[PDB]
Design a protein around this nucleic acid. Structure first.
Length: 65
RNA sequence: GCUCAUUCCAUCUCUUAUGUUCGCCUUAGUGCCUCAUAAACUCCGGAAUGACGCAGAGGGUGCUUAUCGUCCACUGACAGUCGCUU
């Protein structure tokens, strides 16, 4: 799969985050952490499939972030 | 093309009664005739077009939606130089 840096939520970030352009995913989280995620882009390329931390809910009338 | 309401070219002509005043005559004559109140028809020396048919001639009609004009600012992407390492 794939995970853009920007898509990440507070749970993935450490309690002590820092703002220096925040480009540092190693600083955000060390790998292996358990994850919560929904299918985002149907894999349709040799490139990875895309996924987002921000999940969504499909309600008949409503949609929840 | 044929033949024709057409188009833009055709050279092409006249009238009765209204009351009146002044220029003039008939000698009454209701006038000849200036002013002057309204009513009343036509007619061929070019060059285009439409009107049928010559000749081609094998979907329509009515009414129900369209909300989108201005204006204000988070902003994104797996495919040589060197600043680098172990």
């Amino acid at each position: 799969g794939f995970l853009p840096l920007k898509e990440i939520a507070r749970e993935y970030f450490p309690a002590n985050y820092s703002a220096h352009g925040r480009p540092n995913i190693k600083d955000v989280l060390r790998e292996g952490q358990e994850v919560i995620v929904q299918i985002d882009k149907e894999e349709r390329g040799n490139k990875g499939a895309a996924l987002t931390t921000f999940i969504s809910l499909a309600g008949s009338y409503l949609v929840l972030m």
